[PDB]
Design a protein around this ligand. Structure first.
Ligand SMILES: CC(C)CCC[C@@H](C)CCC[C@@H](C)CCC[C@@H](C)CCOC[C@@H](CO)OCC[C@H](C)CCC[C@H](C)CCC[C@H](C)CCCC(C)C
Ligand SMILES: CC(C)CCC[C@@H](C)CCC[C@@H](C)CCC[C@@H](C)CCOC[C@@H](CO)OCC[C@H](C)CCC[C@H](C)CCC[C@H](C)CCCC(C)C
Ligand SMILES: CC(C)CCC[C@@H](C)CCC[C@@H](C)CCC[C@@H](C)CCOC[C@@H](CO)OCC[C@H](C)CCC[C@H](C)CCC[C@H](C)CCCC(C)C
Ligand SMILES: CC(C)CCC[C@@H](C)CCC[C@@H](C)CCC[C@@H](C)CCOC[C@@H](CO)OCC[C@H](C)CCC[C@H](C)CCC[C@H](C)CCCC(C)C
Ligand SMILES: CC(C)CCC[C@@H](C)CCC[C@@H](C)CCC[C@@H](C)CCOC[C@@H](CO)OCC[C@H](C)CCC[C@H](C)CCC[C@H](C)CCCC(C)C
Ligand SMILES: CC(C)CCC[C@@H](C)CCC[C@@H](C)CCC[C@@H](C)CCOC[C@@H](CO)OCC[C@H](C)CCC[C@H](C)CCC[C@H](C)CCCC(C)C
Ligand SMILES: *C/C=C(C)/C=C/C=C(C)/C=C/C1=C(C)CCCC1(C)C
Ligand SMILES: *C/C=C(C)/C=C/C=C(C)/C=C/C1=C(C)CCCC1(C)C
Ligand SMILES: *C/C=C(C)/C=C/C=C(C)/C=C/C1=C(C)CCCC1(C)C
Ligand SMILES: CCCCCCCCCCCCCCC
Ligand SMILES: CCCCCCCCCCCCCCC
Ligand SMILES: CCCCCCCCCCCCCCC
Ligand SMILES: CCCCCCCCCCCCCC
Ligand SMILES: CCCCCCCCCCCCCC
Ligand SMILES: CCCCCCCCCCCCCC
Ligand SMILES: CCCCCCCCCCCCC
Ligand SMILES: CCCCCCCCCCCCC
Ligand SMILES: CCCCCCCCCCCCC
Ligand SMILES: CCCCCCCCCCC
Ligand SMILES: CCCCCCCCCCC
Ligand SMILES: CCCCCCCCCCC
Ligand SMILES: CCCCCCCCCCC
Ligand SMILES: CCCCCCCCCC
Ligand SMILES: CCCCCCCCCC
Ligand SMILES: CCCCCCCCCC
Ligand SMILES: CCCCCCCCC
Ligand SMILES: CCCCCCCCC
Ligand SMILES: CCCCCCCCC
Ligand SMILES: CCCCCCCC
Ligand SMILES: CCCCCCCC
Ligand SMILES: CCCCCCCC
Ligand SMILES: CCCCCCCC
Ligand SMILES: CCCCCCCC
Ligand SMILES: CCCCCCCC
Ligand SMILES: CCCCCCCC
Ligand SMILES: CCCCCCCC
Ligand SMILES: CCCCCCCC
Lengths: 231, 231, 231
């Protein structure tokens, strides 16, 4: 395990996701409100899935070698397995907060699936120049998602409770900033142009992942917006 | 890319799915009705997914070699990845049109999953005679789906709005004819008996795919059946 | 096929799932009640999926070799493909019976996904001692599911119809006993410590699978709890 310099960040990531999972699990024990239960379920599952995939990367299972540029390049494929399930759960948290219509939710989840799926294909593609074609398609799917979060959701939040409108606005802003960093790190890291070494890349993704999951969850689950308006 | 004679049909397929995706995306921009949004979301996602998988076939990612009959046989596995997601979306379009009950929808999607999954296993099976066992099981799942579309849905459409009944009937008929061709092409093509060469097989699937997705979508999204009855 | 001593149990399993599938399919033909249709759909799909995966194991497709302990160890990976889809369907049968809230259903299905997914990783892991780390995480996800079935569902059933409360209690008890055997068989069988040989392991899983699917389904589909209260 320690044979890879990036192991320290995989281990820290595993620990922080594990701790985040346990914290949300305990916190949600005292919850009976049916609406709050939905948000706790979604939000606890996110770091639990990430915990398993960080562990698989730490132990070496979630790593494969991909030939491109005349080299055997270490590619952590387990990231995409994580993201396939956790990024639509994160979007679902946002969509339920603002009572999004079903068509909009399906558009978001579908675009998200395309985003992660094409990122996976790009990560595993052996023809170097083609990796960036997949990156571009994935990034276009991301831009669609960000567009919807701003010009379909923000003006939906404003007709809702003030506490859900303010909580949505904060989580929207956190999401757009954090999620936009992922394609940049991929592009300059070992999957793309290879300018930033894998150990630093792994650190960067770990900070983004913990912030986008445990950070996000801490903000959401401390808000009164997750509860039905009750006396 | 041009090293494979079937590349021209993969390229045309990619282009037509891409163009179809953009057309539906633009067309649905001016839509606020919650019901119509569902149909636009579902129907736009279908060629978008197909676009990505056609591209993966064009670039060579979605192709593998399978030993059977003492030969290395080129198998485009990306078709099944496409179909796994797009065929239940197509069925969902039909089921929502007639306000199908939840049990019926689950039966359809489940049978569809079995249909595509067993087709994939058959496509990748190395014992030649066993490929046709999987083809038979998949075809039985197809026949179940077609049965339900006729003797569970058609008489559901007739108690609904005339515009939804007439639109459903047309899309049902398009679906049954087009979908029934797929097992025949598989059986006589490079996956099955090998009587029709891969380049012609690829052409045939491209015509079926564009018709079943973009053709289907053009009929559906031009109907007033996708809108709630409103003043 | 007969080259593997466990083939007889794979063949019997295939037959019993096939027969169970046909029986439930015929039985549900005379059903119009929308609630009952849901239970028939879910419950018929379960042995149908299991039939396909038992067949893939019989024909040899669903088997791979995994190096650990200095040996090539036969691992039937198709079990996890089965279980990935059938165990959440089984939980859905239980959850719908007691009209579980959406948050609880998502927690169950999510924990179940983690349970099966980590079992799959453990089954395919090449470092022997690490296989048991994945077994432990999977078992913890199982224990969560069993906890919810007892201390979240049982007291939900009691405020419902007596026929649904009594049917739920029986199916809950069947589920907890049968499902708890699976991690034990894995641990002592060819995936784990290797004390029980593969042919006996295969027998054990076949008895558990038929009981947990066809047995379970026979109890559920003969109950009046699956019908809406109607005059
Ligand atoms: C009911 O609605 C609220 C339940 O949501 C909360 C439900 C949770 C989503 C349940 C899912 C967590 C499972 C219990 C997962 C089990 C293994 C976990 C990964 C635990 C890992 C952390 C520990 C090992 C440090
Ligand atoms: C509604 C939304 C969910 C829409 C989803 C959007 C989605 C369509 C976007 C594209 C997804 C698609 C790229 C998934 C591809 C998975 C694939 C990378 C798995 C690895 O297999 C690739 C090659 C080795 O590189 O296998 C070597 C050759 C092997 C023989 C491969 C044969 C097995 C195939 C992988 C079977 C395909 C199954 C499905 C792709 C399962 C989807 C997995 C998940 C990653 C989407
Ligand atoms: C809101 O409900 C309506 C939105 O549906 C319409 C929503 C669409 C389903 C959004 C999904 C499309 C994504 C934007 C996919 C991005 C890449 C596409 C494959 C674009 C490819 C076509 C172009 C490259 C020729
Ligand atoms: C409700 C509905 C959805 C019901 C669904 C119906 C469904 C049950 C029908 C059968 C689906 C099942 C056949 C999927 C099999 C996928 C498999 C072909 C992927 C390729 O792996 C096959 C061999 C190489 O040929 O791998 C070589 C050996 C490797 C070590 C394989 C180990 C990895 C396994 C593939 C893990 C299994 C994961 C699940 C099958 C994911 C499902 C993928 C999708 C195609 C259904
Ligand atoms: C409508 O709601 C009730 C339908 O549920 C019942 C619907 C069923 C879930 C339909 C799914 C079964 C498909 C017809 C599967 C076809 C192949 C089967 C595996 C048949 C195998 C058994 C036989 C070959 C012995
Ligand atoms: C809401 C709930 C559903 C939550 C779900 C919980 C879930 C997160 C729990 C963990 C699931 C995760 C372990 C699935 C891993 C599948 C993996 C074993 C498939 C086989 O690939 C493993 C190695 C060979 O051993 O591939 C060799 C290297 C290859 C290059 C691998 C590259 C292809 C990757 C497999 C692509 C990943 C796609 C997704 C994992 C699809 C999920 C399949 C299913 C088994 C969950
Ligand atoms: C918890 C993990 C999260 C929130 C991950 C988010 C990841 C993305 C938004 C990834 C986006 C990518 C692209 C837009 C193109 C390049 C490849 C990706 C997959 C890194
Ligand atoms: C957009 C793509 C569509 C509508 C594809 C439909 C495909 C089928 C109905 C495929 C059916 C098959 C069988 C019935 C058995 C042989 C294998 C298949 C998968 C080709
Ligand atoms: C129809 C099949 C059923 C009901 C299978 C149930 C399987 C399980 C509950 C498996 C549990 C496992 C663990 C808890 C850890 C070890 C690995 C598994 C996957 C066997
Ligand atoms: C969105 C953030 C992307 C920028 C990442 C900056 C990383 C700077 C680290 C120094 C680069 C290491 C190069 C020498 C090894
Ligand atoms: C459902 C349509 C299946 C029939 C396809 C007919 C294809 C005819 C093309 C000629 C066959 C090529 C054989 C000589 C290369
Ligand atoms: C939950 C049941 C697990 C116990 C399984 C008992 C199997 C006993 C069979 C005898 C073991 C075979 C060892 C000699 C080959
Ligand atoms: C490819 C995996 C996509 C599914 C991820 C799980 C999250 C799905 C959330 C469903 C949202 C509800 C839509 C109506
Ligand atoms: C194996 C992939 C199956 C899922 C495909 C996505 C479409 C699912 C549509 C869900 C229909 C709603 C059922 C209640
Ligand atoms: C990884 C596969 C998980 C999906 C299995 C299919 C069963 C899903 C049942 C959905 C229950 C409804 C939740 C709201
Ligand atoms: C186009 C929608 C406006 C809100 C999205 C902001 C786009 C940020 C760009 C992210 C950088 C990705 C490379
Ligand atoms: C049995 C249901 C009647 C409607 C379905 C028509 C079946 C068409 C056969 C398709 C050919 C597949 C090989
Ligand atoms: C902790 C919840 C109480 C009900 C679950 C009973 C646990 C049975 C243990 C199963 C054995 C697995 C190794
Ligand atoms: C070796 C790099 C070749 C450049 C490929 C860039 C493709 C980016 C596509 C953006 C439309
Ligand atoms: C080499 C071909 C052997 C014939 C197999 C046909 C099987 C079809 C099954 C239909 C019930
Ligand atoms: C070779 C076996 C080494 C023992 C591993 C047991 C790990 C079990 C983890 C339970 C917390
Ligand atoms: C990680 C295993 C958890 C089993 C005990 C249940 C914890 C309490 C959860 C309350 C919903
Ligand atoms: C509760 C702490 C969980 C941390 C387990 C994984 C950390 C890796 C240590 C090497
Ligand atoms: C908008 C046109 C999209 C076409 C891109 C793929 C066509 C392949 C050209 C070689
Ligand atoms: C209807 C009987 C189904 C049995 C088919 C599979 C049994 C395997 C026989 C070798
Ligand atoms: C993006 C950083 C999130 C910070 C989380 C802090 C949570 C405290 C309530
Ligand atoms: C099956 C062929 C479909 C033809 C689509 C034409 C759409 C015009 C409205
Ligand atoms: C766990 C054993 C189940 C027994 C099923 C018998 C069904 C008869 C109604
Ligand atoms: C990591 C366990 C958290 C302890 C409880 C925190 C207050 C709910
Ligand atoms: C008003 C919300 C500001 C949140 C910005 C957080 C940036 C990481
Ligand atoms: C809305 C601001 C987006 C900031 C992008 C930051 C990418 C590192
Ligand atoms: C391909 C872009 C379509 C242009 C608009 C067509 C009329 C909505
Ligand atoms: C009355 C509907 C006829 C549609 C037939 C289309 C055949 C491709
Ligand atoms: C309902 C008519 C079906 C026609 C099947 C055509 C197969 C090529
Ligand atoms: C296996 C076929 C079952 C025959 C009908 C049983 C009574 C519904
Ligand atoms: C009162 C229900 C008892 C069911 C026990 C079944 C054990 C297999
Ligand atoms: C509730 C009793 C569980 C029995 C476990 C049996 C495991 C073989």
């Amino acid at each position: 395990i320690t044979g890879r310099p990036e192991w320290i960040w995989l281990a820290l990531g595993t620990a922080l996701m594990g701790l985040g999972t346990l914290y949300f699990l305990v916190k949600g024990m005292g919850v009976s409100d049916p609406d709050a239960k939905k948000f706790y379920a979604i939000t606890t599952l996110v770091p639990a899935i990430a915990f398993t995939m960080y562990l698989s990367m730490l132990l070496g299972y979630g790593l494969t070698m991909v030939p491109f540029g005349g080299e055997q390049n270490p590619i952590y494929w387990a990231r995409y397995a994580d993201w396939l399930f956790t990024t639509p759960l994160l979007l679902l948290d946002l969509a339920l907060l603002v009572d999004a219509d079903q068509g909009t939710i399906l558009a978001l989840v579908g675009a998200d699936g395309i985003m992660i799926g094409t990122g996976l294909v790009g990560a595993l593609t052996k023809v170097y120049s083609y990796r960036f074609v997949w990156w571009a398609i994935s990034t276009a799917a991301m831009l669609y998602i960000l567009y919807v979060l701003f010009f379909g959701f923000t003006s939906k939040a404003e007709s809702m409770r003030p506490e859900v409108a303010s909580t949505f606005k904060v989580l929207r802003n956190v999401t757009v900033v954090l999620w936009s960093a992922y394609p940049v790190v991929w592009l300059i890291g070992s999957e793309g142009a290879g300018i930033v070494p894998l150990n630093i890349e792994t650190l960067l993704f770990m900070v983004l992942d913990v912030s986008a999951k445990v950070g996000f969850g801490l903000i959401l689950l401390r808000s009164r917006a997750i509860f039905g308006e009750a006396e």
